Design a protein around this ligand. Structure first.
Ligand SMILES: Nc1ncnc2c1ncn2[C@@H]1O[C@H](COP(=O)(O)OP(=O)(O)NP(=O)(O)O)[C@@H](O)[C@H]1O
Ligand SMILES: Nc1ncnc2c1ncn2[C@@H]1O[C@H](COP(=O)(O)O)[C@@H](O)[C@H]1O
Length: 214
């Protein structure tokens, strides 16, 4: 099945993707992960995202759209996949029709705005995997270390409170209309839609999710 995780930054998309990927076995394809890798390794494709990411602005449609298509082909998109962070704008929405990528479920995690800052400043990730944790809301079993490999956890460059305030404006201005969008694809029959409550505890959003899924 193909799935799109739609939501505000810090709503909990990455955290649940891990579980959907482990459980269902469909690969997890996230743009922000991709882009952060391209600029670190110095990649021709995506290495330009550096500055925009840092500013908290969204990267250009035409560059994100290429990363995706390039991934959807690399021997795994057949069991289907999970879009963790895409599409982010209507034009990004549109390229998926005009390329033929359909989907089965569109999950919107709703989480109040007043909740984002503290969820992003407590964020610690394991880049070599994408595992996220929260020093306070979902700390790792051993402090400052990943559970699976014993490795050191770091923090995203764009997880400064001022930047996330920039990130919410963009999101309200460009990504939020996608809710209405897939609400429409739903009404026509091209996919299934379901709003989940991202303020519940980690173990509680997964259940709800499994409850929608199967
Ligand atoms: N259900 C939850 N309740 C409390 N804390 C959570 C919950 N879900 C995730 N978190 C934490 O909050 C931060 C945001 O969750 P994360 O899963 O990384 O979100 P994200 O939606 O993928 N954001 P972004 O990657 O910027 O688009 C991480 O620190 C998580 O540990
Ligand atoms: N689909 C996208 N379109 C535009 N920018 C994106 C996109 N996906 C990720 N990025 C960039 O990555 C930054 C952080 O992504 P994320 O890891 O989803 O929170 C966002 O501020 C964007 O700059």
């Amino acid at each position: 099945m193909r799935i799109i995780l739609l939501g505000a930054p810090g709503a909990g998309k990455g955290t649940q993707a891990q579980f959907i990927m482990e459980k269902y076995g469909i690969p997890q394809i996230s743009t922000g992960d991709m882009l952060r890798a391209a600029v670190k390794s110095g990649s021709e494709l995506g290495k330009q995202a550096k500055d925009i990411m840092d500013a908290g602005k969204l990267v250009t449609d035409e560059l994100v759209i290429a990363l995706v298509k390039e991934r959807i082909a690399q021997e795994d998109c057949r069991n289907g996949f999970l879009l963790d962070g895409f599409p982010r704008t209507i034009p990004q929405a549109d390229a998926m029709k005009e390329a033929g990528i359909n989907v089965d479920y569109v999950l919107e995690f709703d989480v109040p705005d007043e909740l984002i800052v503290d969820r992003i400043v407590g964020r610690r990730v394991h880049a070599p995997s994408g595992r996220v944790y929260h020093v306070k809301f979902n700390p790792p079993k051993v402090e400052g270390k990943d559970d699976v490999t014993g490795e050191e956890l770091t923090t995203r460059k764009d997880d400064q409170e001022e930047t996330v305030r920039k990130r919410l404006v963009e999101y309200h201005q460009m990504t939020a209309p996608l809710i209405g969008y897939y609400s429409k694809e739903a009404e026509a029959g091209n996919t299934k839609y379901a709003k989940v409550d991202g303020t519940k505890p980690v173990a509680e959003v997964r259940a709800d999710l499994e409850k929608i899924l199967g």
